[PDB]
Amino acid sequence: QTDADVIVIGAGPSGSYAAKLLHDQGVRVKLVEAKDRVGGRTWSTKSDAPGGPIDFGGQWIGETHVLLPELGAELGLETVSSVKPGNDLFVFNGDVEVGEEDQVPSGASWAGELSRSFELLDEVGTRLGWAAPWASEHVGELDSMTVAQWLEQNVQSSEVRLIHEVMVNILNGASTTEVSMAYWAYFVHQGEGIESLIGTRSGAQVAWFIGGMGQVTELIADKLGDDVHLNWPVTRIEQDPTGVTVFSGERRLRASFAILAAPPSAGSRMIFDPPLPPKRAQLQARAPMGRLAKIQVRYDEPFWQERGLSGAAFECGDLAFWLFDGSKPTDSLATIVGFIGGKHLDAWHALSPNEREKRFIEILVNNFGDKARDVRYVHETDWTVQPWTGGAPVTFMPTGLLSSAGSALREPVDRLHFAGTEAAPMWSGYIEGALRAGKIAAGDVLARLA
Amino acid sequence: QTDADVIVIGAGPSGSYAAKLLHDQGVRVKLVEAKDRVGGRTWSTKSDAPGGPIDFGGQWIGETHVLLPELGAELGLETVSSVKPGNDLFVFNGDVEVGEEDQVPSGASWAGELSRSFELLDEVGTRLGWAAPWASEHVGELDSMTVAQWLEQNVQSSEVRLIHEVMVNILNGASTTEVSMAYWAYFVHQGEGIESLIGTRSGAQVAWFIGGMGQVTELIADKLGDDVHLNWPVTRIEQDPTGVTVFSGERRLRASFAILAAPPSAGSRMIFDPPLPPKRAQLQARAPMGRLAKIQVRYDEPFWQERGLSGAAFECGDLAFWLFDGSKPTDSLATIVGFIGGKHLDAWHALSPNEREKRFIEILVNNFGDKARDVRYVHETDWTVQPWTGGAPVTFMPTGLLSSAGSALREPVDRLHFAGTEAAPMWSGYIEGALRAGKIAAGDVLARLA
Ligand SMILES: Cc1cc2nc3c(=O)[nH]c(=O)nc-3n(C[C@H](O)[C@H](O)[C@H](O)COP(=O)(O)OP(=O)(O)OC[C@H]3O[C@@H](n4cnc5c(N)ncnc54)[C@H](O)[C@@H]3O)c2cc1C
Ligand SMILES: Cc1cc2nc3c(=O)[nH]c(=O)nc-3n(C[C@H](O)[C@H](O)[C@H](O)COP(=O)(O)OP(=O)(O)OC[C@H]3O[C@@H](n4cnc5c(N)ncnc54)[C@H](O)[C@@H]3O)c2cc1C
Ligand SMILES: COc1ccc(CC2=NCCC3=C2CCCC3)cc1
Ligand SMILES: COc1ccc(CC2=NCCC3=C2CCCC3)cc1
């Protein structure tokens, strides 16, 4: 006797979407979530902050994403463009260089090597591919070196190196000395290339949902009603010839199939009986979350526009950030958003909270002008302290893992299927990947139920 | 109101010893253990195997270890020498070279570069030190490269490279492409140097306890009686100004202090409230267990001695092992013990159990002669599937971790103290380190109780 046909573990976008698809087909589903809320690495509030809704986790929609906007539309959400005209900034340890709209500064001495380094990175990625990077003839060597070592071998300009360092410390939440070059190159390729991932005008970042990205999971949970269990951290998964038992301490739920819709690192904390196969066990134990914090400051007006600036800034150096204008036309205040990750976040953490806020204000003054001092609201979200997530924005891998265990990112283990964005064939790391992986897992399980 | 003065988490040698020391001073202690047994990575049975007691985990005592033999003596255990005279073997993808007792084969073409590579490794280790390797001026660069890269830069002989590869895959349970060179060099230095760790006649491996190493923890548990809780996996630690609450699901225990006597990876599965400081959180998430299996075959007699062989073999190559004669004079059968780790264990795992046993017998026949076919008993212990341990023999670290978070190996966090062998100033990775770290944590907590 079963409590459900399928138990879905994790109510982020991936698990919420898989549960929704199954429920929509009349499958009996339980969606169990460790935290006191749904959303996972997406998290927002319509009213807790002055000036309008605010997002604490992932919030941007890409121009080639389709599951995400279609889901949003189906749930009744409206999008607004996130694109910010004006001159983007490239800042090198406080020395500000002004782009031409989203392009490099006029006559920048580093533009040529930057373009060549991006082409080289894309070529490494293409040699690995998204379908099966672990099977590529080039992966063993690439997976035995770090991104930092690849930069040392292929980049000479300090500006280009610092741009690549901020890219990795942000988009993988980890230092170039920590991330396998094979993993990084695969990650960028399967996100449709480097221009896709760093473009402010076209690429993976062009729109937002009015009201916050957290709505997506909340609305799904609304419809699932009592089949959602919050405060239900899974501690053990047992399998047998006729189904799967999922435990939270002594609490238990029985089903025919289960879907793990959380990062490999989340699986590593669970006990499996029988034990998982070796590649999946190693993957869960050795693919950590990156580390990332998201600092937001609100103002009466987007005063950076007085200097003809977009508010986008690649703030490179010892305390590197990515900064953007996060303001929506329907907000009553303007918002600047700063992200800091990896080794830069390690440095940020070594400062006091007061020193951090003062340092960020000084960066905003340097980049955007003195009116940055007239703050209305300041907020920091440290993803490394969020229970049952423990980091951000994505999973990364150190040397040796992708080539020796990456095939376990997607393969089911008997009656346990894997969703979560890390399992997506493309757009792993992104909400779109969460949704694609949830769709795949739901389809596979539905086929086994028929 | 408290259940105990101190809660010790983990009943391996470290936590058992810390609980014992506290209890001996009249402190009220609880020792809580996740598994259905005490011992952790030590594990033995007096009677389940034909031919005498057998050890499934760590069992050797070193010549400079003192807490371990003194504890054994205090508990009523007797030691016996483990040293095996005869010619040790150095095997390179099946080509057997016969040592002169424990020394390299007469006139070996690789002897000179081997000695130089060992001296070089010791010198790297000495540059880092055991007291505070994370503070050494040399650690950032060393921690940004792998052991494999250091070998590529400093070793040319294939024999010497393969010897170093088996050393790392066994002693850290991980590939040379996975382990930070800084971590490996520090690990060897703090184990008193490479000759200490690989010597068959003098060094870290000279004696055993008759009856099995598991006795150490079992006897301690006997005296602690009902203050030991088995099947009590800690899932959450909460701290406040007056003490610490430790949870296993909904079950809870309250004390004034707690000691975590388990690897950083064990801590990563727990929820901490308040959250741990950043360096400790990163250390727990990013310092994995190595991977290791221990295969044992019993025979009527140590027939390898018919060829003048000790039974020790460094079996190098694609499927590398360390082999030793594990026979005690009081056993009624002879025992050969094989260890396989890291990338070699990955290969081992890709074979069927039957193919593994046949392959091991073929290795024994090649190395020691045809009588290896006349088996009496065969047993494998795969440490990667042991619940709440998940690997062996030790914790390792990938690039970037020791230099950015290693200072969190030993430092208490408010009322939570860290024991476990990884916290030992010296002999981290070994039972002696477990005991030293337990002694330190017990002393610190006792001082806070007075
Ligand atoms: C600051 C930040 C900014 C980001 N920006 C963007 C952006 O602009 N665009 C983009 O596309 N993506 C962005 N992301 C990434 C996006 O948030 C993730 O890709 C996405 O949320 C992945 O969804 P998921 O469902 O796979 O996993 P998650 O969102 O991590 O959900 C996993 C769920 O599993 C739960 N869980 C974990 N362990 C257990 C357990 N033992 N038992 C039960 N439940 C458990 C967790 O609590 C969580 O709710 C951002 C992320 C962060 C942190
Ligand atoms: C095959 C093998 C051979 C070895 N050979 C040797 C040798 O010859 N010499 C040597 O000196 N060392 C050897 N060792 C290493 C030695 O076993 C370890 O150094 C030692 O056991 C470390 O002791 P510990 O108490 O620090 O940790 P462990 O022995 O790992 O004990 C940790 C304990 O914590 C428990 N625990 C974990 N998570 C939780 C939780 N959430 N709640 C409650 N309890 C929890 C575990 O179940 C375990 O009992 C060997 C190890 C292996 C695997
Ligand atoms: C080039 O401009 C942008 C603007 C916004 C984002 C959103 C985003 N997506 C992936 C995860 C992450 C971020 C932003 C910062 C840190 C982590 C990305 C590129
Ligand atoms: C040079 O001879 C030996 C013999 C025995 C051991 C015991 C030992 N201690 C550290 C952990 C570990 C082993 C042995 C194999 C694998 C892992 C070491 C060296």
PDB file of N, CA and C in Angstrom, chain B residues 374-405:
ATOM      1  N   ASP B 374      44.413 -22.045  -3.968  1.00  0.00           N
ATOM      2  CA  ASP B 374      43.778 -22.938  -2.999  1.00  0.00           C
ATOM      3  C   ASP B 374      43.226 -22.123  -1.820  1.00  0.00           C
ATOM      4  N   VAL B 375      42.217 -21.304  -2.133  1.00  0.00           N
ATOM      5  CA  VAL B 375      41.664 -20.381  -1.144  1.00  0.00           C
ATOM      6  C   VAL B 375      40.851 -21.134  -0.099  1.00  0.00           C
ATOM      7  N   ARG B 376      40.797 -20.570   1.108  1.00  0.00           N
ATOM      8  CA  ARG B 376      39.920 -21.056   2.167  1.00  0.00           C
ATOM      9  C   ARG B 376      38.770 -20.109   2.484  1.00  0.00           C
ATOM     10  N   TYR B 377      38.910 -18.816   2.181  1.00  0.00           N
ATOM     11  CA  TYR B 377      37.975 -17.782   2.608  1.00  0.00           C
ATOM     12  C   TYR B 377      38.353 -16.504   1.878  1.00  0.00           C
ATOM     13  N   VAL B 378      37.343 -15.765   1.422  1.00  0.00           N
ATOM     14  CA  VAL B 378      37.530 -14.520   0.674  1.00  0.00           C
ATOM     15  C   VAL B 378      36.511 -13.516   1.198  1.00  0.00           C
ATOM     16  N   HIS B 379      36.955 -12.288   1.457  1.00  0.00           N
ATOM     17  CA  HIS B 379      36.051 -11.283   1.996  1.00  0.00           C
ATOM     18  C   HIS B 379      36.451  -9.905   1.496  1.00  0.00           C
ATOM     19  N   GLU B 380      35.467  -9.082   1.163  1.00  0.00           N
ATOM     20  CA  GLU B 380      35.726  -7.712   0.734  1.00  0.00           C
ATOM     21  C   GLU B 380      34.957  -6.748   1.627  1.00  0.00           C
ATOM     22  N   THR B 381      35.601  -5.654   2.042  1.00  0.00           N
ATOM     23  CA  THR B 381      34.923  -4.572   2.748  1.00  0.00           C
ATOM     24  C   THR B 381      35.053  -3.334   1.876  1.00  0.00           C
ATOM     25  N   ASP B 382      33.928  -2.827   1.405  1.00  0.00           N
ATOM     26  CA  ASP B 382      33.896  -1.622   0.588  1.00  0.00           C
ATOM     27  C   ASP B 382      33.516  -0.466   1.507  1.00  0.00           C
ATOM     28  N   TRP B 383      34.490   0.381   1.850  1.00  0.00           N
ATOM     29  CA  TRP B 383      34.172   1.458   2.787  1.00  0.00           C
ATOM     30  C   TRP B 383      33.283   2.539   2.177  1.00  0.00           C
ATOM     31  N   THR B 384      33.165   2.607   0.849  1.00  0.00           N
ATOM     32  CA  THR B 384      32.340   3.664   0.270  1.00  0.00           C
ATOM     33  C   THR B 384      30.854   3.453   0.526  1.00  0.00           C
ATOM     34  N   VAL B 385      30.433   2.236   0.870  1.00  0.00           N
ATOM     35  CA  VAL B 385      29.015   1.992   1.106  1.00  0.00           C
ATOM     36  C   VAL B 385      28.672   1.924   2.586  1.00  0.00           C
ATOM     37  N   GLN B 386      29.615   2.223   3.480  1.00  0.00           N
ATOM     38  CA  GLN B 386      29.311   2.178   4.914  1.00  0.00           C
ATOM     39  C   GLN B 386      28.526   3.427   5.306  1.00  0.00           C
ATOM     40  N   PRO B 387      27.303   3.284   5.828  1.00  0.00           N
ATOM     41  CA  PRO B 387      26.468   4.457   6.098  1.00  0.00           C
ATOM     42  C   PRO B 387      27.089   5.334   7.177  1.00  0.00           C
ATOM     43  N   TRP B 388      27.005   6.648   6.962  1.00  0.00           N
ATOM     44  CA  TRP B 388      27.560   7.696   7.822  1.00  0.00           C
ATOM     45  C   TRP B 388      29.086   7.691   7.859  1.00  0.00           C
ATOM     46  N   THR B 389      29.729   6.926   6.986  1.00  0.00           N
ATOM     47  CA  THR B 389      31.161   7.088   6.736  1.00  0.00           C
ATOM     48  C   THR B 389      31.390   7.361   5.261  1.00  0.00           C
ATOM     49  N   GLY B 390      31.007   6.441   4.381  1.00  0.00           N
ATOM     50  CA  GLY B 390      30.988   6.756   2.965  1.00  0.00           C
ATOM     51  C   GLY B 390      32.350   6.861   2.299  1.00  0.00           C
ATOM     52  N   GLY B 391      33.390   6.308   2.903  1.00  0.00           N
ATOM     53  CA  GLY B 391      34.684   6.290   2.252  1.00  0.00           C
ATOM     54  C   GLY B 391      35.792   5.953   3.229  1.00  0.00           C
ATOM     55  N   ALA B 392      37.035   6.150   2.747  1.00  0.00           N
ATOM     56  CA  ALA B 392      38.181   5.656   3.490  1.00  0.00           C
ATOM     57  C   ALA B 392      39.454   5.901   2.690  1.00  0.00           C
ATOM     58  N   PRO B 393      40.645   5.829   3.310  1.00  0.00           N
ATOM     59  CA  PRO B 393      40.884   5.674   4.744  1.00  0.00           C
ATOM     60  C   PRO B 393      40.758   6.999   5.486  1.00  0.00           C
ATOM     61  N   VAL B 394      40.820   8.098   4.730  1.00  0.00           N
ATOM     62  CA  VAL B 394      40.933   9.435   5.306  1.00  0.00           C
ATOM     63  C   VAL B 394      40.116  10.442   4.505  1.00  0.00           C
ATOM     64  N   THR B 395      39.931  11.620   5.102  1.00  0.00           N
ATOM     65  CA  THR B 395      39.516  12.819   4.385  1.00  0.00           C
ATOM     66  C   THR B 395      40.657  13.305   3.488  1.00  0.00           C
ATOM     67  N   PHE B 396      40.323  13.811   2.302  1.00  0.00           N
ATOM     68  CA  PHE B 396      41.309  14.512   1.474  1.00  0.00           C
ATOM     69  C   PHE B 396      40.765  15.879   1.091  1.00  0.00           C
ATOM     70  N   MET B 397      41.612  16.694   0.450  1.00  0.00           N
ATOM     71  CA  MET B 397      41.122  17.991   0.012  1.00  0.00           C
ATOM     72  C   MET B 397      41.540  18.259  -1.425  1.00  0.00           C
ATOM     73  N   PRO B 398      40.638  18.858  -2.230  1.00  0.00           N
ATOM     74  CA  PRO B 398      40.992  19.245  -3.603  1.00  0.00           C
ATOM     75  C   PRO B 398      41.664  20.610  -3.617  1.00  0.00           C
ATOM     76  N   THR B 399      42.032  21.109  -4.797  1.00  0.00           N
ATOM     77  CA  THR B 399      42.701  22.405  -4.872  1.00  0.00           C
ATOM     78  C   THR B 399      41.869  23.500  -4.218  1.00  0.00           C
ATOM     79  N   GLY B 400      42.561  24.385  -3.494  1.00  0.00           N
ATOM     80  CA  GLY B 400      41.975  25.593  -2.976  1.00  0.00           C
ATOM     81  C   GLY B 400      41.434  25.513  -1.567  1.00  0.00           C
ATOM     82  N   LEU B 401      41.263  24.312  -1.002  1.00  0.00           N
ATOM     83  CA  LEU B 401      40.545  24.237   0.273  1.00  0.00           C
ATOM     84  C   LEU B 401      41.465  24.462   1.467  1.00  0.00           C
ATOM     85  N   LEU B 402      42.574  23.727   1.559  1.00  0.00           N
ATOM     86  CA  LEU B 402      43.432  23.865   2.737  1.00  0.00           C
ATOM     87  C   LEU B 402      43.850  25.317   2.956  1.00  0.00           C
ATOM     88  N   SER B 403      44.250  25.996   1.887  1.00  0.00           N
ATOM     89  CA  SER B 403      44.707  27.375   2.021  1.00  0.00           C
ATOM     90  C   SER B 403      43.582  28.359   2.361  1.00  0.00           C
ATOM     91  N   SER B 404      42.322  28.053   2.040  1.00  0.00           N
ATOM     92  CA  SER B 404      41.245  29.013   2.273  1.00  0.00           C
ATOM     93  C   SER B 404      40.375  28.692   3.481  1.00  0.00           C
ATOM     94  N   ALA B 405      40.423  27.465   3.991  1.00  0.00           N
ATOM     95  CA  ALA B 405      39.558  27.059   5.089  1.00  0.00           C
ATOM     96  C   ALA B 405      40.217  26.096   6.070  1.00  0.00           C
TER      97      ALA B 405
END
